[PDB]
């Protein structure tokens, strides 16, 4: 039993809720919140800009030190950093950016990072401002992630369409 409330069960291990991931993180304080990161950990907008804003820019400060030490992530890759006031940890995961022509096949590699964590609160990787079809992102999540994932979807119409078109 965990504290995730009001989720609609999609599969054995995948659950979904109409919620802003930022507000959901503040309420639940999960062990792991996933950020929809880019390779430079520049948290300007989307999930990343919103999470970072909720940390009062502490996520960005930490991220800049990470990049100065380690260099950029790979598309499809991830790193674990602090969750600040939102979660114990933040798993920064880089899905491909379709607007920049990045390989959509890398979306599966991106979701594989979730399997290193038993339970996660997460957005739909590569969706939103990253340019991919959210219905496809949900499908890849279900067919790749084996650990327990709680997906927060910001947009109500999108949440409704994601649920309705699933089985
Ligand atoms: C029109 C479609 C909106 N999108 C794009 C996809 C990813 N975005 C997010 N996913 C979950 N929580 C979120 N909080 C946010 C706060 C923000 F300022 C900006 C973005 C998000 C966000 C799912 C979704 O609903
Ligand atoms: Cl977004």
Swiss-Prot record:
Membrane topology value: Multi-pass membrane protein
Known outcome of mutating residue 31 to A: In strain: Mu/B.1.621
Limits of the Macro domain: 1-167
Protein localization: Host endoplasmic reticulum membrane
Top-rank taxon, per record: Viruses
Effect of mutating residue 164 to L: In strain: Gamma/P.1
Protein activity control: Inhibited in vitro by GRL-0617.
Reactions accelerated catalytically: Thiol-dependent hydrolysis of ester, thioester, amide, peptide and isopeptide bonds formed by the C-terminal Gly of ubiquitin (a 76-residue protein attached to proteins as an intracellular targeting signal)
Subunit structure: May form homohexamers. Interacts with N protein.
Annotated function: Responsible for the cleavages located at the N-terminus of the replicase polyprotein. Participates together with nsp4 in the assembly of virally-induced cytoplasmic double-membrane vesicles necessary for viral replication. Antagonizes innate immune induction of type I interferon by blocking the phosphorylation, dimerization and subsequent nuclear translocation of host IRF3. Also prevents host NF-kappa-B signaling. In addition, PL-PRO possesses a deubiquitinating/deISGylating activity and processes both 'Lys-48'- and 'Lys-63'-linked polyubiquitin chains from cellular substrates.
Name the record gives this protein: Papain-like protease nsp3
Originating gene: rep
Residues of the full protein shown: 1025 to 1191 of 7096
């Amino acid at each position: 039993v965990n504290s995730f409330s009001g989720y609609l069960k999609l599969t054995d291990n995948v659950y979904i809720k109409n919620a802003d991931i930022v507000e959901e993180a503040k309420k639940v304080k999960p062990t792991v919140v996933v950020n929809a990161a880019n390779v430079y950990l520049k948290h300007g907008g989307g999930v990343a800009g919103a999470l970072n804003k909720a940390t009062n820019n502490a996520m960005q400060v930490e991220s800049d030190d990470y990049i100065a030490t380690n260099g950029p992530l790979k598309v499809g890759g991830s790193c674990v950093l602090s969750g600040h006031n939102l979660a114990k940890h933040c798993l920064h995961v880089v899905g491909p950016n379709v607007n920049k022509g990045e390989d959509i096949q890398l979306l599966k590699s991106a979701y594989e990072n979730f399997n290193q964590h038993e339970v996660l609160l997460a957005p739909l990787l590569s969706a939103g401002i990253f340019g991919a079809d959210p219905i496809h992102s949900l499908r890849v999540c279900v067919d790749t992630v084996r650990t327990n994932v709680y997906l927060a979807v910001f947009d109500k119409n999108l949440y409704d369409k994601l649920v309705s078109s699933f089985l």
